Subunit: 580 residues, 2 copies
């Protein structure tokens, strides 16, 4: 019974051996008094040959796709090799064939991928309703095995660096603010509920208070958000925390971990260290806090070059950002880019073509008086097209930032490879507008920069935080920060945020007390593992790297779960349905 | 700033080096113009010495227990070595000392364990309320680090054997029967709920149907049970499933996995293979389906020796089980054992002492007529005490089985080491009594023994299942079985269990359809990881091997979760509180 080899493992070196294989029939071909069966298992395909003189011929004649069988035979060299199958040089002459399970016709084909051919994927609702058949496809199994390899690589590296894996609670306390929590009724007392964790944040910080120098966990997180932007009700994160560290210790450890993961999983060598850009530098050069560095097209400030002369729009604005495109755009291409600029509420997009010794179209006449100085600042050459956005420094950068991205598509620029970078020095507080007090941009426990400590009172506007974001190809894959370990500083901060000393004792009471027993300096980070895997695989959605995901409504077509429960089961919990 | 070494890592080989250490003050001793501070971190303790001539003396004079500090000094040999501390041969002459965080007085001491001293534990409610301080104790950290090592060992071994780790859903469908499910309200539609998983059972079987030859996962399971028998609302299991296997392939793989874990984690060598006992053999020899093999005291059937003579009680009973204790019991010891026997509803405990050439006390007079035959069957010698339990074969065995265990305590027998064993050949159906149809003893998907297939109709009484339990020192740590992969056989089984073809389509509908697309033979097992860890560590409860557990009422003293939620938050979910 026991198989001798995986079907897709057979090679020219097995010629002459007697083998026993078990798997699925990928395809059957009757070539006239000769039946060929392509047997499949996780490692690949192998051609089986049944001749009329073989005792297995009768059974080979009744087999259909997806039937599970056990085959016995002699491995022999193929009269003609198939250059695209790892087992292409051999075939198995059958001596026996037995059916272990029959199968009805699948709603969609799963055989093409295994031949190296392109597949026609069925609608996603069908794939999800029959996920166990979708998971038989080569590409899906490659994604799941890659996810295994990545997590194993993470364990090998962190175990080697002294990190202790700690499992955190799933039934915790609900919090009045943040994101909406998923709740769990406490049977023994109506009105009491557990909440599923949005993140292990407080627990990993308490593990640092406990003296576990360094921790990690592949943690499942749950957030009941009105998400349609390709997000799942629950997702996976690599969670990590360390003690007695400064920002640089965290970044260096993560760069080395990430290079290890890519080397082991994809066999790709990443250059270290990763570039590091401050929030301000990223906004000015790329118009975004999550820059895509796979192409250039850097933004240039040219506002100074315009106030000595005089072109209305270009001077009432404190900033004039320019972008030099290596192509002569058409009127339709310009109009499309202008739409993008306006979406990010910018009054308009100005343009001009760069010809030999002069400009053409758009605002060309206003550029001639500064031609020389402009060509240097922008480094534009004949044939290029200049685009401008004038207005508030933040609006101009953000708007042109969006144009730069859309421009990469129209021009069909080559965006390949993996470009990682750290964005650091973010501000501590967010846009609280003009009525009253500020709010946090990261999380209440994020440490403000030490040298900026004093400014915390007189000008909390430009006080930076010790926070960092990890971005890959224009996408945020992770983020973290150095935490506040001083109970008094935490308060001083809570003074600014305007959170009452009665509200703190309600939403963070147990944690604030922990800080009074000697908390060491500490900090960490969390990676969106599903998102990282989707980018590593070039998948269009994180649903391609999760075995059994939910659809866009948060429902599960396979199990039909969000389902009704017996009225008495709810009554047992002391609950009744109403409206919402 | 950065430390040069972990405090507890210093050795005689570091003498002469300048070091920077960071940690907690475990204890301070003022020896008169000389202050000694024991600095602690995850690796252990180091003695720091501050002299009046040192710039660090002033600070050393104000430090208290649990304060976090950074110390700089020169390592030097100790004038007197401390033989019980890994760093006992050295000490650090301080040149500098800085306070990073002060700490108030802890509710209970955490310093003794680090010195090797016996530790005085506080009430469990206090330990849980201040779990981050409890976790500073040496024994708690040893437990957590051991848990890390065991899980890493499992990943190494299974990855090497070709298993693919797959993460399963946490939000699934609720099922009308089994154990009570924890529910999660579906916001977008009142009356709809997700259920937390009781086990990944159906998902790992669908992963076999998908063609992933072998899978594993360290899975979190949730069961809303009225548990007080040292059980948590959620627990962890090592979950594993394999394709194209027979019972023996699963047992062998698990024995090698377990031997690997014990060797890597504890440095203990387990003898393979593990003994295998059938359910019947285990019940007859030890009176239990989870036998403790750390000692003998095997049960003996002696009922046959009594029907030719005639002692009332000993004949109306189909069974008379005997146990020979290597000690002359007192009347109090006998009375205590009789209580245990009655607990497991047995009418009573008969006894007699074995003297030289005869019996004494109890039912001695009725034993004399069979003395020779009895002494052979029981192998009893002078000085031993014979115990008997007469009645239904099942009651006698179970009752005396309990007596054997309690007897091990009274006699103070030595029960040390780790004795693993497999209990196999369990029956397929349970005690459905005399009114109607049977019920399952394992799970609906457990495969009945093949050779017993026919008896499934005419005498389903003695049809065995392909199920197996893994036992360690009298405790069940795991269990699994070969699954049914034939949709027709599954039905045939459902015929016996009496489950309607409409109820199946409601509780297993999606899964029954999966079996029709070609399911391969498969089977697996699940280990109660928390229970295994508690046994490996000699812990009295699984709460000692879980970082943040719940108390006996399923509540969390640390966070105070089960908590009430705003009336409007519930209304948002379309729910209102009632009673229970």
């Amino acid at each position: 019974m026991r198989r001798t080899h995986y079907a897709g493992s057979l090679r020219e070196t097995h010629v002459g051996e007697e083998v026993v294989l078990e798997g699925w029939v990928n395809r059957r071909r009757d070539l006239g008094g000769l039946i060929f069966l392509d047997l499949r298992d996780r490692e690949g395909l192998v051609q089986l040959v049944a001749h009329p003189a073989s005792p297995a011929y009768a059974t080979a004649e009744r087999v259909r796709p997806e039937w599970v069988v056990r085959a016995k035979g002699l491995v022999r060299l193929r009269p003609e090799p198939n250059p695209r199958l790892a087992t292409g040089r051999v075939e198995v002459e059958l001596s026996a064939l037995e059916v272990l399970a029959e199968a009805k016709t699948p709603p969609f084909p799963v055989d093409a991928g295994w031949r190296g051919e392109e597949e026609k994927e069925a609608s996603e609702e069908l794939r999800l309703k029959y996920r166990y058949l979708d998971l038989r496809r080569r590409r899906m199994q490659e994604n799941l095995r890659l996810r295994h390899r990545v997590i194993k690589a993470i364990w090998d590296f962190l175990d080697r660096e002294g990190f202790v894996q700690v499992e955190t609670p799933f039934l915790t306390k609900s919090t009045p603010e943040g994101a909406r929590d998923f709740l769990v009724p406490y049977r023994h007392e109506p009105g009491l509920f557990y909440a599923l964790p949005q993140s292990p944040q407080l627990f990993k910080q308490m593990l640092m208070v406990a003296g576990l120098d360094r921790y990690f966990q592949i943690a499942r997180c749950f957030r009941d958000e009105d998400l349609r932007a390709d997000r799942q009700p629950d997702f996976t994160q690599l969670d990590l925390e360390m003690s007695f560290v400064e920002v640089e210790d965290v970044l260096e450890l993560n760069e080395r971990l990430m290079a290890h993961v890519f080397r082991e999983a994809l066999g790709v060598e990443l250059p270290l260290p990763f570039p590091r850009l401050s929030y301000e530098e990223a906004m000015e050069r790329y118009g975004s806090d999550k820059p895509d560095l796979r192409f250039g097209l850097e933004l240039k400030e040219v506002g100074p070059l315009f106030r000595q002369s005089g072109f209305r729009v270009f001077q009432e604005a404190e900033s004039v950002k320019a972008l030099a495109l290596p192509k002569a755009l058409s009127r339709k291409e310009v109009a499309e880019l202008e739409e993008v600029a306006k979406r990010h509420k910018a009054q308009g997009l100005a343009w001009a073509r760069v010809e030999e010794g002069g400009f053409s179209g758009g605002v060309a006449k206003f550029l001639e008086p500064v031609r020389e100085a402009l060509l240097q600042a922008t480094e534009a050459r004949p044939g290029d097209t200049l685009l401008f956005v004038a207005g508030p420094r933040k609006v101009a950068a953000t708007a042109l930032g969006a144009v730069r991205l859309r421009a990469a598509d129209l021009l069909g620029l080559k965006r390949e490879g993996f470009r990682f970078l750290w964005v650091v020095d973010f501000p501590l507080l967010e846009w609280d507008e003009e009525e009253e007090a500020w709010t946090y941009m990261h999380h209440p426990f994020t440490s403000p920069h030490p040298e900026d400590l004093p400014l915390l009172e007189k000008d909390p506007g430009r006080v930076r935080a010790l926070a960092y974001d990890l971005v890959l190809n224009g996408v945020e894959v992770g983020g973290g920060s150095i935490r506040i370990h001083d109970p008094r500083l935490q308060a001083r901060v809570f003074r600014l945020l305007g959170i009452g000393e009665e509200e703190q004792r309600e939403k963070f009471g147990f944690f604030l007390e922990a800080l009074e027993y000697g908390a060491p300096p500490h900090g960490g980070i969390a990676w969106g593992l599903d998102r990282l895997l989707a980018l590593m695989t070039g998948s269009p959605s994180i649903r391609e790297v999760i075995a059994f995901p939910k659809n866009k409504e948060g429902k599960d077509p396979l199990t039909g779960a969000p389902s009704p429960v017996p009225e008495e089961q709810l009554r047992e919990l002391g609950l009744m349905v109403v409206r919402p």
